[PDB]
Amino acid sequence: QISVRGLAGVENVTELKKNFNRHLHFTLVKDRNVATPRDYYFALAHTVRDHLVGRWIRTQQHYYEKDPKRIYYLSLEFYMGRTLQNTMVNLALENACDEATYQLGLDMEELEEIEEDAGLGNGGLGRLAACFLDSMATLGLAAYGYGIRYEFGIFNQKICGGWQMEEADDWLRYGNPWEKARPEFTLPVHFYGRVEHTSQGAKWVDTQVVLAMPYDTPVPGYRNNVVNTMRLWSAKAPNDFNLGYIQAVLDRNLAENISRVLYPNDNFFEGKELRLKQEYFVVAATLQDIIRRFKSSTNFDAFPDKVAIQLNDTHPSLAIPELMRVLVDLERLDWDKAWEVTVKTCAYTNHTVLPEALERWPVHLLETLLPRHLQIIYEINQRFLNRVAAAFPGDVDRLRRMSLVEEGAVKRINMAHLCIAGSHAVNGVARIHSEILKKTIFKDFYELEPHKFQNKTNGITPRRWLVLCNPGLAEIIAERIGEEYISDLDQLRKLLSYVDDEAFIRDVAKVKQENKLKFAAYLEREYKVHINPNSLFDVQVKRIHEYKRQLLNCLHVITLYNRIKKEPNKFVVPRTVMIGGKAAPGYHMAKMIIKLITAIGDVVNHDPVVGDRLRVIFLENYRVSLAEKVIPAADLSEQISTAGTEASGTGNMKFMLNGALTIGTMDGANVEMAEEAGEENFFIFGMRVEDVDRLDQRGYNAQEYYDRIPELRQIIEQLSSGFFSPKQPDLFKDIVNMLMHHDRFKVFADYEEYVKCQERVSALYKNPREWTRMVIRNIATSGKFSSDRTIAQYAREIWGVEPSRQRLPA
Amino acid sequence: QISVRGLAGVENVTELKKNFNRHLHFTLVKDRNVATPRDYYFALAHTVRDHLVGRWIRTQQHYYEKDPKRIYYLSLEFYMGRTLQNTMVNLALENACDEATYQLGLDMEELEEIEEDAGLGNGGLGRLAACFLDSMATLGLAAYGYGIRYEFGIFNQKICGGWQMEEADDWLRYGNPWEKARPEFTLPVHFYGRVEHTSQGAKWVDTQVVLAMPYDTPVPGYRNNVVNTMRLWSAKAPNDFNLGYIQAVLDRNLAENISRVLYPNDNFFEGKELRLKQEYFVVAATLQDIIRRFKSSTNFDAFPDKVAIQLNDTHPSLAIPELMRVLVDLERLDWDKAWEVTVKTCAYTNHTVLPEALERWPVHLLETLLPRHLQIIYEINQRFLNRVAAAFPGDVDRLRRMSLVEEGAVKRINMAHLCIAGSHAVNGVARIHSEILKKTIFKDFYELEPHKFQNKTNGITPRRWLVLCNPGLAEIIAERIGEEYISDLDQLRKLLSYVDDEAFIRDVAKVKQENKLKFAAYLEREYKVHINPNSLFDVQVKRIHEYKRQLLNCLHVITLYNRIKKEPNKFVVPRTVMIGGKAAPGYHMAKMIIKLITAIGDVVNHDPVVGDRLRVIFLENYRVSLAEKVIPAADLSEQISTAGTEASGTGNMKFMLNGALTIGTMDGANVEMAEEAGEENFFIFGMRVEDVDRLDQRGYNAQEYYDRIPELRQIIEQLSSGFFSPKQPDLFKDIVNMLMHHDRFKVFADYEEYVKCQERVSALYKNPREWTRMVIRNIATSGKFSSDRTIAQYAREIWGVEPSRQRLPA
């Protein structure tokens, strides 16, 4: 049908059809008379998967013969989404499979909906790891993602009575066709025990053993014939574990609980032993696998020339003391040489400045679980602090601030300090975030070792986030500028010469309307809700958190409702306001915010005077597969975090790429987006970082705003009095209380500018032609935010490797 | 190589080879350079499995179109062993695959050893279910085996310091290529809750739900193109189960523990709640599946014409009250009609008379777990006892003996009484066992309903137990009488005309020596032990239990040792005494018996004066795959249970089929074996059932034997004084104590006759020609003990269906 989806040649179509039937018969043991819709999905997944194997075997053989420097991307999260469509896109199979299945009497789109998301992450950090994997493959890098094969990923969210309910995401229930178990690489991981000192070295003894069994998932590059590996460890008890008899077998569950479930904390930090175990487990298994591959290529001097380990936040920070442990205790290297190797091998990416999120592990936990690692951390700290003391003599408070060991009620280890000390590179994830790291939270470390500190602005993969989810837009772009932009996104700049093009303007507006109709349909079928597809689609999708200020969005929505009720017969630009996202199950305020959104909807959506002019919808179960549907449909992207709180954001980049305009604060990557697109082509409002600082110095008094803005006073009074909860008048008292007395994120301080800026959004939407020209200017300058650019910078500036866009032989 | 293994045609060999490579590449993602031995096994299993699918799909389609009466064999145990070789044998593929793999540079025998046994049973009961499945398929019966997919089967046994240690049998660790998950047939099973009464019927409410997910395994008939299904249920939590959050997800393990592990109790009875849950779980899921298939063929009158349910012991006895529950509570049939249907549908096979083995479930357990089932059982019992009371007026003690409800300290339900009341047929498993049922433990029931009581003498499948494990013997037989005996084992009678045949005698003796050399080699490699292959192979393999009298065998062994030590320079027929079997982990006396065997070995095997004349070996980890190796190697089969205690035995039949002579008591099937072969061709010794009864009446005094047999006195004194345990002089005091004061199984009473009979065994072995002629006479009359005969009798006399030996179209 459409060109960017590849060729549907007679040979290939014929061959896909017979392989589909072969799998339906031999693999699924069905015929066309008893086959379920899921059998059909599985037949298709096996047919497509077959096309990966040759390239996968030769890619890995190629790395063995050429022996390049290997990149190990360590993460506790890989938010992959679905694999079927992505595989077809990157193998250029999509049109062929569409034709093959159509001829077999099946709708491929329907089969695609059967696949479960691999929901092995929470949000931006997990999704970033997935985009990175795609880019590393596309750029021909010898890269491996290492993580944990969770049995349960991020919970499925159900909304019951306007409240979030959690249900287990049993994503492996029917089997995962995209994984290959690698039992030959099963590795022991040790826990507890004690440290013994002998004549020559310390020994870690009397440990409990859990086995790590790896499962390999392919990661195809975009049409370059490269297939890299994502290797995820699963926990297994050894066979003599606890070996009255029945209980011993049942107790195997305890050991295997390590890989059972993803922690859904979102940003913040729970010092739970099981989380610590997960962090060590991925680190210990991965490092043994790395060393084994390195020896199979004594001379650890060359280790950093053949290995890079990227630490995705502090979650895998134990790689630093674990590498030291293996080098010093097992390989018998001296400390200083081992340390040299470690620092040159490891690099650290920070993904937050929110203090409550930072990992600070109690000493007593590490003492019991990982006694030798604690001793190594203490030694690291002593040597580091001697370095600080020599550089800044007499500065006693710097010593205590920079310590890896934090003093107090309970002693803790600051894992972020551990990461900086033991890494050759530390990066933030957007220019303003990286500046904040040097200027504030890691200021002392920057002064000691300025050469360590870098920026690597985040990006998204244009494969999943344009070609896959928005083929209609990819196509109209490909019609004018060709197809090479899909792996060289800067080429979108060529679209600037079409901003006055009458044919192109009409096409961009058409694609959007088409996407909006499709999504208005999806809302009807799967959720039985009515929406006007001619309204402005105003969307805020992301995890629920106070700093992201879904609350500020709620305030705007209520303002519009009150304005309509005041002057019912005045024209307003119709809006469909869509807010979606999961709340961490232990996060009370976020759960209350969800309830507020649904309660606003209940009032707004059933007011006869409002009509089709304003609708408020909570998008249930926001996840990667839902993002692929809602983002292409959006007109307005809400990116309204308090300046200084969103490290980068990546949802922002996805909306920009897909033809939505952005209303946002100068925070995270928004700054660089407005910089690329021009400020005139962005709806910027609110306090900058400096204004937030100024207000913090004075003291933030929310009352002042309440006293001076009558429209805001009415909203707070409506909330307090039970306007949005008639049967539970005080339901939202926690919300009013926080906004009035304990708002860390200054919701009221940005309210006036936000509403004003939103009026300007409405003004522009009234003129379709000028709205669309500004959209073209956004799409056209979105090239910088390709994760291909991001990865090329990591490779050249951190890992010391050259990316290649050259094909491997097919 | 050998003819019974089928043809190795050029086309088939070529095709198997390319399918092997195709699977190695596409399925296992390997090439010949990185493939592990296990990859090769899996490639071969996928290649062979492919040949099942056509026949499997058409068999099941055939049952749908012809709609025959379906047989449901319900068992908590299916002791399957390995599947690869059995599949090749029954598909006539064995020689072709041997050639294909040889040409690929691989030894098939080596690949076969990689496969894990499906160890989903304990012993004879579990193995019987497996032989039955094979025969039902071979006989063209529309049969389904239903059970539980245990995550862990029977424990692997390790011997440490002569003591049994248990290790978890994680048989699914690498995936099972022989199962197909059937998620579309996932069914809810209910637990706990309470019973409510409404205007029209009782309702079972407030239950906890566990899901039952079925996995289908093919069961191929012998070269008839029939492939039947074994369907095993797996336990899965529903997704909202327990849904702080982390704990709720981890707690899913509790629900799923139902299908986690096989109870290894062996014969006896532990009233453990988890076992009760397993019993209901298999029953509830299976019955819903049966009814669903029946409706898809309101009119439950025809239910018994289209369904037979065979209850394999009392383990699935809850099928009776569960069927009533569905019929009365859900389908709204009246009691009497529902009961009619139930009785005509269900039949019961008893597999024991040992009182401690009988299931008697405490009322309070059923009350909490299955409240509606308890009410149904009470009602069944009331109606049954009214029947008893009308038939035997005034007989008040008969009423209490026949009650399903047993009175006492704790009230219990006698499940065996439940089974007889609600079944149209009750059978024992050998003629003497079935007689004992009518005469003693079920005497009252026999008097009330004599027409219910039947015999179905056990059998074994000549496919696994001759063709597969002993191809050399199958071949020399096929050379003289053709191949048709493999599915019509009575044809072995034709071998009687070869008993004087000089060529045949030499061949039978050759095959045996070959099997003994092979097994003497296996012992060397895998266990580094030395044995003389020219010695008599004296083997007792079976679970360890006092009634099986491994102890009597031990006494004989010590007698031989003492006789050699007394007269070192006298000739004795050399023996290798092999004893193997697992002990139930909670069975102390059985664990002590194992230690005794190893301790005897330690003394005997290292005595310079003994030499190669006597060796005592404990065969570790006896299981189906080890049986296939040891049985063909055996010369003497030890079947020495106290008369009246072994219901049938089946190991006895396997040894007879494979050219060993039998020394045994007139117990279980031994009686019918000696009857078939002639008593002159069997080494019969010891008390008959009547002699045991006579002794019980008088009082068994072990002292009398000790006082009158000097050779026995010496043994007991050696045991007591620490001759067999120098560092732990009193180690075996529990054993001496039991034999002297508390022996239920009268070991001393059979000692003299046993030793005498054993001397006669040695006498015959000294004359190879006459030993072998007696062997031919055993093989020649073993036809009755084919499970094809057994199943044909179940079908005609219980299920009301005609077996067919006709081929389905290929």
Ligand SMILES: OC[C@H]1O[C@@H](NC(=S)N/N=C/c2ccccc2O)[C@H](O)[C@@H](O)[C@@H]1O
């Ligand atoms: O089908 C369900 C099962 O599939 C197996 N995968 C196999 S046997 N081969 N996979 C081959 C493969 C081939 C190309 C790309 C990805 C792949 O997983 C997996 O090892 C197993 O965990 C999973 O449950």
Ligand SMILES: OC[C@H]1O[C@@H](NC(=S)N/N=C/c2ccccc2O)[C@H](O)[C@@H](O)[C@@H]1O
């Ligand atoms: O760089 C990619 C993205 O990283 C996110 N940080 C996240 S999602 N941190 N998550 C931390 C976390 C910590 C413990 C448990 C679950 C979690 O998601 C940042 O908030 C976002 O600005 C940035 O665009």
Ligand SMILES: OC[C@H]1O[C@@H](NC(=S)N/N=C/c2ccccc2O)[C@H](O)[C@@H](O)[C@@H]1O
């Ligand atoms: O390979 C490992 C996996 O294999 C799957 N089986 C599939 S996808 N097909 N099986 C087809 C089949 C075909 C003929 C005979 C027996 C069979 O299981 C099983 O459903 C799964 O539980 C298992 O872990």
Ligand SMILES: OC[C@H]1O[C@@H](NC(=S)N/N=C/c2ccccc2O)[C@H](O)[C@@H](O)[C@@H]1O
């Ligand atoms: O009919 C087949 C065989 O059945 C066996 N009975 C067994 S193996 N009962 N097992 C009962 C049992 C009961 C609870 C838990 C585990 C168990 O193996 C009989 O002992 C044997 O004589 C007969 O040949």
